[PDB]
């Protein structure tokens, strides 16, 4: 309704935000490689794994943006993958948890980034894009409206963020440029712009600076509703032992959590991170949600 105490309820933090506001303006916490919580093997975790708890936990902690990577199986089904590794998760598994969360908390909405992570299996009857639309995207939860999506036409639906080419069914965010490992800017739909900082695999120093720099612009340009700001706090960088996404996340998450606190911004943008949990002292996702206080 009209109170900043509705931002402290994670499951329904999107309730008090007016139905007028374009999803881009709102600042939302997200999860990188959302389906890696099932990796329990040691040599698998230090490489793949970027999250520890399931989707529902992720959503109950305030997360609304999910990085979903997939591969086409010969059984004609889309499954979650981290590079070549088969995460023991599937798409239906994700779409079903979303619906569950959205039924219990209809005041919310989840944005689902979908990207082809691995080459299709030979048995594949149809293509990856076509198989997704024909068998999944056709479900009624997926919002089929485009343009600058308002929080009003998104409640209860799933705002798909296409990150795969060859789409044929309208709905959500259209596939835009997006180069490998770096910060960039391009134009999305009719009325929109995107500045994304996906600088994975880079030094810790450079990384932190890139997050702060990117978050610095979103802060100044707080009233440009026509501008998407995706800020990835993830540091993939392999190296195994204490180089893993977990080692890095221990510093970056709290680090950025303070940055947002101290500065007391009016906009922080869509912040995607690794290891959403409650270990980290400051809590990034909570601070990202809180910066939306300016919208009520």
From Swiss-Prot:
Biological process, per Gene Ontology: lipid catabolic process
Record-linked PROSITE patterns: PIPLC_X_DOMAIN
SUPFAM superfamilies assigned to the protein according to its UniProt record, in alphabetical order: PLC-like phosphodiesterases (SSF51695)
Assigned EC number: 4.6.1.13
Catalytic reactions of this protein: a 1,2-diacyl-sn-glycero-3-phospho-(1D-myo-inositol) = 1D-myo-inositol 1,2-cyclic phosphate + a 1,2-diacyl-sn-glycerol
Location of this chain's protein in the cell: Secreted
Record has Lyase as a keyword: yes
Keyword entries, A-Z: Lipid degradation, Lipid metabolism, Lyase, Secreted, Signal
Domain (PI-PLC X-box) ranges: 22-163
Gene3D superfamilies the record matches: Phosphatidylinositol (PI) phosphodiesterase (3.20.20.190)
UniProt main location, coarse: secreted
MF annotations from Gene Ontology: phosphatidylinositol diacylglycerol-lyase activity; phosphoric diester hydrolase activity
Residues at the active site: 32 (proton acceptor), 82 (proton donor)
Gene Ontology CC entries for this record: extracellular region
EC top class, as a word: lyase
Function: Cleaves glycosylphosphatidylinositol (GPI) and phosphatidylinositol (PI) anchors but not PI phosphates.
PANTHER family linked: PTHR13593, SI:DKEY-266F7.9 (PTHR13593:SF113)
Protein name: 1-phosphatidylinositol phosphodiesterase
Source organism: Bacillus cereus
């Amino acid at each position: 309704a009209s109170s900043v105490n509705e931002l402290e309820n994670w499951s329904k933090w999107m309730q008090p935000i007016p139905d007028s506001i374009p999803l881009a303006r709102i600042s939302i916490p997200g999860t990188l490689d959302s389906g890696t919580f099932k990796l329990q093997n040691p040599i698998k975790q230090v490489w793949g794994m970027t999250q520890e708890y399931d989707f529902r936990y992720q959503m109950d902690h305030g997360a609304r943006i999910f990085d979903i990577r997939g591969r086409l199986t010969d059984d004609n089904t889309i499954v979650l993958h981290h590079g070549p590794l088969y995460l023991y998760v599937t798409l239906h598994e994700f779409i079903n948890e979303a619906k569950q969360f959205l039924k219990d908390n209809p005041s919310e909405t989840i944005i689902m980034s979908l990207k082809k992570e691995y080459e299709d299996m030979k048995g594949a009857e149809d293509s990856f894009s076509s198989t997704f639309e024909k068998k999944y995207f056709v479900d009624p939860i997926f919002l089929k409206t485009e343009g600058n999506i308002k929080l009003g036409d998104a409640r209860g639906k799933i705002v798909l963020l296409k990150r795969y080419s060859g789409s044929n069914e309208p709905g959500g965010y259209n596939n835009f440029y997006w180069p490998d490992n770096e910060t960039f800017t391009t134009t999305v739909n009719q009325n929109a712009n995107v500045t994304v900082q996906d600088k994975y695999k880079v030094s810790y120093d450079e990384k932190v600076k890139s997050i702060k720099d990117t978050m610095d612009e979103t802060m100044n340009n707080s009233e440009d509703l026509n501008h998407l700001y995706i800020n990835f706090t993830s540091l993939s960088s392999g190296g195994t032992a204490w180089n893993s996404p977990y080692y890095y996340a221990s510093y970056i998450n709290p680090e950025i959590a303070n940055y947002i606190k101290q500065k007391n911004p009016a906009r922080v943008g869509w912040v995607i991170q690794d290891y959403i949990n409650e270990k980290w002292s400051p809590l990034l996702y909570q601070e990202v949600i809180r910066a939306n206080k300016s919208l009520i």
